Write a protein that binds this ligand. Sequence first.
Ligand code: HIS
Ligand code: HIS
Ligand code: NI
Length: 496
Amino acid sequence: HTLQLAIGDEPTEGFDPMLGWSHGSYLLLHSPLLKQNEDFSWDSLLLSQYQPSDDGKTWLLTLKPDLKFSDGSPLTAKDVAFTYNNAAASGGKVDMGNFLSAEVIDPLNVRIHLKAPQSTFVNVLGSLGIVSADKYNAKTYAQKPIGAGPYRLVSFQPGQQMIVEANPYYAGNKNDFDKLIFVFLDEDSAFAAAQSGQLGVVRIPPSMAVGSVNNMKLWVRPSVENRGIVFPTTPAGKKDAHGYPIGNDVTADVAIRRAINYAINRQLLADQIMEGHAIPAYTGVQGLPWNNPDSAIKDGDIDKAKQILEQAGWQLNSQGTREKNGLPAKITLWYTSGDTTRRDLAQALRSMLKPIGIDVDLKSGSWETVERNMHANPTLFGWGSLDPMELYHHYSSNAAGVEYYNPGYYKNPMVDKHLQQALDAPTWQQAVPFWQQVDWDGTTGAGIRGDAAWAWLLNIQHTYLANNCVDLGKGTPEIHGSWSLLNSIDSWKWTC
Ligand SMILES: N[C@@H](Cc1c[nH]c[nH+]1)C(=O)O
Ligand SMILES: N[C@@H](Cc1c[nH]c[nH+]1)C(=O)O
Ligand code: NI
């Protein structure tokens, strides 16, 4: 069967695990050693056995026999070792952490050596795609790659489409669709093509998940993708390396941040903006094992927000705005244009924070424009993944100002300690208790009970429209990024 999908952003700069697995359409053409389960354990497509040592410093990987690539070339230990070592030394992103080396014992066994225990290396094992040691070249791979994925590339028209076909050498199960065509369209054009019957699967914003489309069915997919506001946690007066202002004199007050957290009604955000297709999120890891269980509050509480503001010395002035030492609680919320739900979320927040006396300005821009103001102003972001490293990216002092990570320049030495403890655990199960202390350790934290570096809002569920004859099956909770639906691609069925 042939299926046409418009599910997200267009892939830019190639299909090479070596250059970066950032896009997320690699799930189509590639396959890592491990695949994550719904209980956050790990299974494997390519391995019969994978055992880390008790020290957590080394991994032993036994490959399944008779594995092949999309071109029919054999998949063995040489290719795994080549993959990991080359991605390690390439220096082009690809976080390998404490990785040292991959040694080939026999055609079916690889031994991975790490500098120190790393609880997140299991995420590397579950992300980095395997390339062919012989056939890999940085020039010809990006355009026409070979992998262990369920599909192999056939055609690619930039700005137009991308055509792939089922890989006969796939080690996993086959679905009911032998050919897939992915069209690159904006959300509205995609919806139009869905209603016209041109496409079988289309991704739509939750706002549009309303009413009935002919010969189509809505699919709500569980997701850890989120929406939240990041606060500048330091006073103003400093600039970064690129001359962008850092800090906000209003939001540097922790009371402001806690009050904003308590005044917001997350359930109303879900029901009124996301059409019920979100769940309230009080953290960046909402619903995950490493989420602090006590990190939730009873929000939409105006009187408590007012009480918090009054306790810190924020009083209404003659103009009806909170003032403290002549400084009014006037803030500007920034967000990225080109997204309707973000505009609506920002507006809704502006309306939600008014009754507690906080005046919210709105400013939308391109990411290039947002980059300049995201350190000096509260900003809308979306994140979320099955990788606990998010907590690091958000709350590590070393991540402050780096790319889009930690724009509020949050620095708490104890939180850094807990993060480092989590990283240095041999297993992720042992790391989980340390990840939770990031929120609150009983003394300090980055959560609401703590410094409240964020006003986290929602975990957004992904919405699709599929033909009535198409079953999208199930998979792990989808994440922030594009082409997340692909995580379920093996389970796809044709019911007509
Ligand atoms: N991932 C973050 C930041 C970002 C910048 N560019 C792409 N993403 C967001 O979507 O809000
Ligand atoms: N690759 C982008 C995806 C994105 C589009 N818009 C926002 N985010 C990211 O990780 O943030
Ligand atoms: Ni993003």
